């Protein structure tokens, strides 16, 4: 099973392409769109936690608006990243809720990102208002520290299934050169045994680099490039990453 | 831990080195191939004596070799018969396998050779340490071109090699998973963390095994392959590109 996001396919072919904006002010998050305007992707994130008046609901509601106005041909994916899980700032569960829920009202957004550990009630509600509009979910889960065993790595991506994820995603990192491997020994179980999905799954760090190349053959769906700076340690530029992936994609 | 330098190329720093194989039947294809190899970005020539047509004479094997070097004056060279066992084209008996090699060696012609680490103990030590009293370096290889054996036995196939003398344990393995393809690495890993005290090669065949050629900076292969134009193998120049884009990440 593929997902069909504004245009694009996703979990067919070449891995997709993910870049995230950060914008600290509107005037911000404007420029940097105009900068990401003609670069390859397949996906703009707004990484939402970067983004000053995010308790604002008119001010988050404008950005949104003006980077639909300037990325046009792109799904939007918006993310607020929780400090729980790496993000620059935290949020109460309702605050963090309200917002995903106030972002799908927009109809400006294609995705949003809701994180596995917020709550199963909160969550299962959150997905059900999102499809009732015809927005997809990308759900997620992040280890900053480590790496769980490959078996806890496949469950977890099996629990966004049920939960109704469109599409699992997990990133996780690595202490030692083994961590990687379980990473993608995790992606592969999860694609034999439980799967019917699109899937996301990154080691992260300079360490993991090569689990953000492979997915093609390891399963997972797509990756995430840099545009200048990347949103997560081991993001290597979109052009450089778009050069692998075809590559690896006709070996 | 040592790295190996053949001529002015240092093999084990920094990004992996390409190696790209010669294969011709006569002296007019050697030659042909040669001029053809000879602009391309690769690091090590390695040339598949096997294919060449009548390796009983030694001659005639002395001259092609002469002709590549002729030809490619810069590159280091590996002279490599593989042997039938192992996926090659024909078969010699141990005794004119050795006598080969000590040619090459003898030769001058060459950098490296390549001695298969299920040759014969005696005979593989008493040439590795024949090619060493001239200058020769050794890539001790093993290929299963059908399936991975466990992590255990690779890691103990690779430790033979060091403990046989090779300058760089080589061994390429065919994946029937996507599971063996990370056997293959995690073996690389271990080999790398405990025991490697020298550059050592490692390779998952085929296009599930591609990962392989590309993260050896990461997890511990000195060198890959590519061509200069088979499932799985990118072009020298794509090659180069990739390895570039990890090394600078
Ligand atoms: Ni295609
Ligand atoms: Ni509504
Ligand atoms: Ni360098
Ligand atoms: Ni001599
Ligand atoms: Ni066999
Ligand atoms: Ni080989």
Redo the contacts between chains.
């Keep these: 099973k593929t997902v069909t996001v504004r245009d694009l396919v996703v979990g067919e072919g070449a891995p997709k392409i993910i870049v995230s904006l950060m914008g600290k002010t509107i005037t911000d998050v404007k420029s940097e769109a105009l900068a990401y305007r003609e670069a390859d992707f397949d996906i703009l994130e707004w990484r939402v936690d970067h983004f000053a008046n995010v308790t604002t609901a008119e001010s988050v509601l404008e950005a949104a608006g003006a980077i639909r106005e300037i990325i046009t041909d792109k799904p939007l994916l918006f993310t607020f990243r929780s400090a729980k899980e790496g993000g620059e700032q935290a949020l109460t569960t309702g605050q963090y809720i309200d917002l995903n829920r106030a972002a799908v009202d927009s109809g400006l957004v294609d995705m949003i990102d809701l994180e596995l550990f917020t709550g199963d009630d909160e969550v299962k509600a959150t997905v059900g208002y999102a499809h009732q509009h015809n927005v997809a979910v990308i759900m997620s889960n992040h280890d900053f520290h480590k790496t769980p065993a490959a078996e806890e790595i496949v469950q977890r991506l099996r629990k966004m299934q049920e939960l109704g994820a469109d599409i699992p995603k997990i990133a996780v990192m690595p202490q030692t050169?083994?961590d990687?491997?379980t990473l993608?020994?995790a992606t592969?179980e999860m694609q034999e045994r439980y799967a019917d999905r699109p899937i996301i799954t990154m080691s992260m760090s300079?360490?993991g680099?090569?689990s953000r190349?492979?997915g093609e053959?390891?399963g997972s769906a797509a990756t995430f490039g840099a545009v200048k700076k990347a949103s997560a340690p081991?993001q290597?530029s979109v052009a450089?990453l778009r050069?692998?992936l075809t590559?690896?994609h006709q070996?």
């Design positions: 050169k083994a990687v491997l993608l020994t592969v300079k360490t680099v090569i190349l492979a053959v390891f081991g290597i450089d050069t692998v590559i690896l070996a």
